[PDB]
Design a protein around this ligand. Structure first.
Ligand code: SF4
Ligand code: SF4
Ligand code: SF4
Lengths: 70, 314, 169, 206, 176, 156, 97, 110
């Protein structure tokens, strides 16, 4: 009966599904409810460092919006 | 919080290759009218645990080691090259995001033959050295054809970053306008992993004959990790699934599904074809794969200029 | 200690060269120079040159010294004092220069050399939306016409050389 | 990779069967012929029983002659399955090796039902056969033989038209007609090279 | 009365040549092999669950030797030494003497099961059906001397398995 | 006490691990090897017991001597047994490897493979049936199941 | 629909062994959970079942006892654990139990 | 530094695995193997075709590294010069393959 090897397939699926969901949840928790700010070029890194300097906390994921200005 | 992510990447890899062995065993059983392991537990769930604990208490083979340091270093290097290489896969975000992640994987896959070379050098038997040299020659040639195919694929993509390749495969899959490159990549993923019907590492003497059972188990886990890696790489880069930026687990489930059916296709193909000869697959690349691959590279590097379809660098 | 990482790797790089400087056997020398190539590529990568570092990994280590190991496997059949003496001599010279650059922070061998950490010569500027070395390499196909011509001609001639001088007749 | 001299060494299974026959009677030497060719177990006794009956100047009864041909021909299905599938196992295609073994297990039950042993039956004896077929045996042979034609077409599908099987097979192992006769060859060797020679058609038995 | 296998001349027309080119490029016969393997994946396997299921066997099955008895309590063997004379492996050793009541009975009936080839000549040469190649086959031993049966072990085997050996010989004796 | 119970639990754990994955080395000598291959058929299916088919002799746990062991083959068989790593078990197929069987009085037949290697399980037959060897393999698994390595190590 | 019939057959397989506890008991002790007609039982406690719809070889089977001659045989089953009167029926000597 | 942290963790896990596979079974007291291949006493033959195909792999990989930077180069202004250069380089690869075909390179190891 062909429906007997599928427990192994399901264990394969949960084994390959746990690390992607785990790293997505860790990325979302660590970056303050946001994605990880990727830096493929130096301009993005400079804006990253500008955010870290502006935020006043030295954590960029606590971003400052319109209310920070007068 | 980074080391937790590293551990949750590296421990399911070992579980996935143990269940590769188990699933391959019952699939090859059921493909050939017999049954797989079902005695140890419910549907053979506890078989890989028995395999691991058996292979972790046995006696070694005690070879006359010419170089003890090289004999120690070969399985460590093999497991390192199989395990640390899974990093830049975008599922849906990589653990470490590189602008040149595909080049990173290609370079370490090209240098992965050092484990085979050191395994051949550690054994004093000259026939093992001959088999190691034959395996190394096959692997380096087949890495050449992999390099050309991947060069064509990311010049179609235009950027070396693996995360942008998901964005590239949003409207249609890459297999639709690169189906001949898809078939050559399918033969290359069938063939680069030292697999049947091109498995010369079993027919006539392996490249690790005098190695102990522990290092043999390490080599097998490393090879199966490379198998799952390149299967998932084919799934991501030729069969890119829909990825919502707010809802990522649908993409994770979808590419997991494609990875599982591609691994099932691997176990399918390995159970349907007799083994080739050394000169036969050397003739397969050096007189049949290489000119077609070069022509495909020429066509795919001439097409986006004439189609006004040069993809963005960024 | 961390901020001198490249320099630390550079020290290891010199160590890697000593690892095959005495040349006891070609296989161990190849292993030592593999390790030295790895740490030298780490030196390159820490300066922001990802493309040149992966050129080192892909071609120098994984595509050419593999051929070196393949050739040296065809000889040097499987089974020194002055080797070890030269090893201690190189170790003493290396450590002596290490204390020289760690105490005086300045030395003279040919020119004036400083021992201060290298984290002062980098750039705070931005290249924009592109890596500088990436499109530096990419400018080969738009400007480097003659260089590509002579490179292809030389590699084809090397193929001719391999076909001819190893024929034996 | 290539060959000019290949010298096989045999004697790893030398039991000295043909000397032990001299110290035993004719009926006692009958189980020795079972163990010579253990994939053609029931065909060797037909050669030994034909030798004794020629000396004894007797002939088997007409029912015994048809049983020896029927169980001789079922042993050709025994042996040729071992021929092709293990040849495919040595080359590398392990898939039809397990497909035909269920069929080879089905004809092992026929050996066990009429004589009592799965492999070494000791059934064919000089002067006929030891025991008769059990009641309803030939009904079970027909229901098996009706469905066996699909299995040969099942085996032929994955090997005859396969290009990988062909490339290992079409130009290795070529003999000529004259040197096959001079080498003492027989069976598929002479038939494969185009020489028309079969003992069942030229010098027939029972 | 002879047929030419592998003497089919292929067609040289454009249709067959193009179809063979499509077979070579598209792996059509390989696709046929894949389809056959897929079809043979979904069939129910013939794996019987040993030891909870057992294979089909015949009443003529040759297995462990046993010594039978009459339906009055007396041992069937009369020490006639036919089985040790007909044995092709000489596994049977018989030593006899006239016992107390004058009956001709065995004193030593040894069967070397490591010597025996399970040919069934003793079970047919016996004129009183004393020795029978019984139905037992699950008697693998951990020690060599446990396979060297004396008279007492064979008689215990006969007393143990008579309830089925009698039924088997009752079902089988009309063929002999 | 704590120690005896702990080593008993560890002993049965490693004992189940060893007995559930017995990888064999088949010696394809004679008739009994063909009977082993027919035990490897889908009907009997050794592979559901954790017993792989045709493993290399450098990683196998058990060896099944199936066939006649002549004088010309005994040094090779002893070399193979010496190469196989510990722990190693030997199962004897057929009357040939038990005591020579038919060829016990032949001039060039070793009277039993016990004279060359230690033998644990003797399987009788000529050939023994496939389910008989399956029962012998299960008997070997039960023999492994009652091993007391760690208890003896702690008691010594 | 068709899969409802297979699901009901699986549910009757679960419920035929006296509940989920008996289902997991026979699953962990025999690795086969199909149901059949109870042919009978011997003195030692081995139950014998018949299911003629299955193919030949699997139609007759036995569930062994948990104690025979004082041996705790909850997991250790043996092929020689069958009395001769049932050894006839199990190995298909005859059709009569 | 996170990449090097991952590399160190992975290498140390491999070291732990090889330490378990190499020194943990040394607790057992099984035996000492005195142990007194087809290669009897002859020297290893120098099969020249393997060395030839290895250096052919080396040359092809070198000019593959030459061929590499096309995805970055595709955004350049002078597209005609790029197209001519790339087509001529792949033509050079085809010509070198044709020469390696003609002068008995792809024979006895095809
Ligand atoms: S079955 Fe044959 S070999 Fe065995 S004891 Fe009887 S006569 Fe001797
Ligand atoms: S043939 Fe029968 S009666 Fe005669 S000695 Fe043997 S067992 Fe006894
Ligand atoms: S015991 Fe019998 S069946 Fe087995 S190898 Fe010997 S002669 Fe053949």
């Amino acid at each position: 009966m062909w429906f007997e090897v599928l427990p192994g397939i399901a264990v394969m699926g949960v084994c390959l599904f746990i690390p992607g969901m785990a790293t997505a949840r860790i990325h979302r928790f660590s970056n303050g409810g946001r994605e990880k700010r990727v830096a493929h070029y130096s301009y993005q890194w400079y804006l990253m460092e500008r955010d870290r300097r502006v935020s006043g906390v030295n954590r960029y994921y606590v971003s400052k919006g319109l209310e920070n200005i007068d | 919080m980074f080391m937790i992510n590293v551990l949750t990447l590296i421990i399911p890899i070992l579980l996935a290759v143990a269940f590769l062995t188990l699933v391959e065993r019952k699939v090859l059983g059921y493909m050939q009218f017999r049954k797989g392991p079902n005695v140890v537990g419910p549907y053979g769930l506890l078989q890989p645990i028995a395999d691991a604990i058996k292979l972790f208490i046995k006696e070694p083979l005690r070879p006359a080691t010419s170089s003890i340091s090289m004999f120690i270093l070969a399985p460590i290097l093999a497991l390192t090259l199989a395990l640390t290489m899974w990093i830049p896969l975008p599922m849906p975000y990589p653990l470490i995001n590189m602008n040149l992640g595909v080049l990173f994987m290609l370079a370490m896959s090209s240098l992965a033959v050092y484990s085979i070379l050191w395994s051949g050098w550690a054994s004093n038997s000259k026939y093992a050295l001959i088999g190691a040299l034959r395996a190394v020659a096959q692997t380096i040639s087949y890495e050449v054809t992999l390099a050309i195919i991947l060069l064509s694929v990311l010049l179609m993509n235009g950027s070396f970053t693996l995360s942008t390749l998901i964005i590239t495969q949003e409207q249609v899959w890459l297999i639709f306008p690169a189906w001949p490159l898809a078939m050559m990549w399918f033969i290359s993923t069938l063939a680069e992993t030292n697999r049947a019907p091109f498995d010369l590492t079993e027919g006539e003497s392996g490249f690790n004959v005098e190695y102990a059972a522990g290092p043999f188990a390490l080599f097998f886990m490393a090879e199966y990790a490379n198998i799952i890696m390149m299967n998932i790489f084919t799934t991501t880069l030729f069969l890119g699934a829909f990825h919502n930026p707010y809802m990522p687990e649908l993409y994770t489930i979808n590419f997991t599904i494609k990875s599982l059916l591609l691994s099932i296709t691997f176990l399918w193909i390995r159970a349907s074809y007799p083994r080739f000869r050394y000169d036969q697959l050397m003739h397969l690349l050096w007189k049949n794969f290489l000119p077609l691959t070069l022509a495909l590279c020429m066509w795919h590097v001439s097409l986006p200029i004439l189609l006004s379809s040069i993809p963005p660098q960024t | 200690m961390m901020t001198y990482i490249v320099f630390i790797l550079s020290i290891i790089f010199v160590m890697g060269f000593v690892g095959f400087s005495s040349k006891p056997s070609p296989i161990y020398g190849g292993l030592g120079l593999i390790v030295s190539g790895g740490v030298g590529c780490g030196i390159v990568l820490n300066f922001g040159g990802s493309f040149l570092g992966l050129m080192v990994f892909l071609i120098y280590l994984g595509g050419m010294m593999v051929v070196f190991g393949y050739t040296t496997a065809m000889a040097t059949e499987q089974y020194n004092k002055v080797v070890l003496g030269t090893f201690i001599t190189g170790l003493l010279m290396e450590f002596l220069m290490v204390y020289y650059v760690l105490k005086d922070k300045e030395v003279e061998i040919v020119f004036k050399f400083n021992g201060m950490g290298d984290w002062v010569i980098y750039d705070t500027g931005d290249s924009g939306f592109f890596s500088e070395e990436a499109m530096g390499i990419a400018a080969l196909y738009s400007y480097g016409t003659w260089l590509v011509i002579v490179t292809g001609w030389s590699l084809l001639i090397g193929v001719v050389v391999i076909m001819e001088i190893t024929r034996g007749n | 990779e290539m060959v000019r001299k290949c010298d096989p060494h045999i004697g790893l299974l030398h039991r000295g069967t043909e000397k032990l026959i001299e110290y035993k009677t004719y009926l006692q030497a009958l189980p020795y012929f079972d163990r010579l060719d253990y994939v053609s177990m029931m065909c060797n006794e037909q050669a030994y029983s034909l030798a004794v009956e020629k000396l004894l100047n007797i002939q088997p009864p007409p029912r015994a002659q048809w049983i020896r041909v029927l169980f001789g021909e079922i042993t050709r299905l025994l042996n040729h399955i071992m021929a092709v599938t293990t040849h495919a196992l040595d080359i590398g295609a392990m898939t039809p090796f397990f497909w035909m073994f269920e069929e080879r297990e089905k004809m092992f039950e026929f050996y066990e039902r009429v004589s009592g042993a799965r492999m070494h039956a000791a059934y064919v004896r000089p002067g006929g056969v030891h025991q008769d077929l059990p009641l309803g045996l030939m009904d079970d042979i027909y229901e098996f033989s009706k469905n066996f034609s699909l299995r040969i077409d099942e085996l032929e599908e994955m090997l005859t038209n396969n290009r990988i099987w062909r490339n290992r097979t079409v130009d290795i192992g070529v003999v000529t007609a004259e040197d096959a006769l001079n080498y003492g060859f027989s069976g598929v060797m002479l038939r494969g090279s185009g020489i028309q020679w079969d003992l069942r058609k030229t010098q027939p038995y029972d | 009365t002879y047929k030419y296998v592998n003497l089919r001349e292929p067609s040289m027309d454009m249709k067959s040549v193009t179809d063979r080119a499509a077979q070579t490029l598209l792996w059509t016969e390989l696709i046929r092999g894949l389809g056959m393997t897929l079809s043979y994946l979904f069939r129910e396997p013939a794996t019987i669950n040993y030891p909870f299921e057992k294979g089909p066997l015949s009443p003529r099955f040759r297995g462990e030797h046993a010594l039978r008895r009459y339906p009055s309590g007396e041992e069937r063997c009369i020490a006639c030494k036919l089985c040790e004379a007909v044995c092709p492996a000489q596994a049977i050793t018989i030593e006899a003497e006239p016992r107390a009541d004058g009956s001709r009975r065995t004193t030593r009936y040894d069967i070397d099961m490591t010597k025996c080839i399970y040919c069934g000549f003793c079970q047919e040469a016996c004129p009183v059906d004393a020795i029978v190649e019984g139905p037992n086959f699950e008697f693998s031993t951990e020690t060599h001397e446990e396979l060297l049966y004396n008279k007492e072990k064979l008689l215990n085997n006969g007393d143990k398995w008579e309830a089925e050996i009698a039924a088997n010989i009752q079902a089988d004796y009309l063929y002999r | 006490s704590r120690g005896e119970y702990v080593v008993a639990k560890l002993d049965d754990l490693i004992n189940w691990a060893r007995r559930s994955s017995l990888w064999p080395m088949t010696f394809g000598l004679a008739c009994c090897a063909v009977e082993m291959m027919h035990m490897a058929a889908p009907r009997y299916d050794m592979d559901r017991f954790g017993v792989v088919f045709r493993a290399s002799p450098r990683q196998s746990d058990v060896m099944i001597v199936a066939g006649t062991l002549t004088n010309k083959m005994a040094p090779a068989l002893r070399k193979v047994y010496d190469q196989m790593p510990e722990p190693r078990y030997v199962v004897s197929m057929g009357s040939c490897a038990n005591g020579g069987g038919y060829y016990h009085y032949s001039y060039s037949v070793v009277r039993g493979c016990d004279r060359i290697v230690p033998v644990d399980i003797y399987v009788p037959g000529c050939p023994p049936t496939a389910e008989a060897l399956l029962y012998g393999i299960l008997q070997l698994q039960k023999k492994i199941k009652r091993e007391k390595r760690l208890r003896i190590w702690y008691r010594r | 629909m068709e899969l409802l019939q297979v699901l009901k057959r699986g549910l009757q397989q679960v419920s035929g062994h006296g509940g989920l506890r008996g289902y997991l008991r026979v699953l962990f002790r025999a690795n086969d959970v199909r149901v059949g007609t109870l042919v009978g039982e011997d003195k030692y406690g081995n139950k014998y079942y018949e299911d003629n719809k299955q193919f030949f070889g699997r139609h007759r089977w036995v569930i062994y006892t948990t104690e025979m001659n004082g041996k705790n045989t909850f997991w250790d089953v043996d092929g020689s654990m069958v009395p001769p009167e049932w050894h006839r029926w199990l190995h298909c000597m005859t059709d009569d139990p | 530094m996170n990449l090097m942290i991952t590399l160190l963790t992975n290498f140390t896990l491999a070291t732990l695995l090889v330490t378990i596979a190499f020194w943990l079974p040394q607790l057992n007291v099984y035996s000492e193997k005195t142990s007194p291949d087809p290669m009897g006493s002859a020297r290893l033959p120098f099969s020249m075709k393997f060395f030839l195909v290895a250096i052919t792999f080396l040359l092809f990989d070198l000019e593959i590294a030459l061929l590499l930077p096309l995805p970055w180069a595709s955004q350049t202004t002078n597209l005609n010069t790029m197209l001519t250069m790339a087509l001529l380089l792949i033509f050079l690869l085809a010509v070198s393959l044709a020469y390696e075909w003609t002068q008995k390179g792809l024979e006895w190891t095809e």
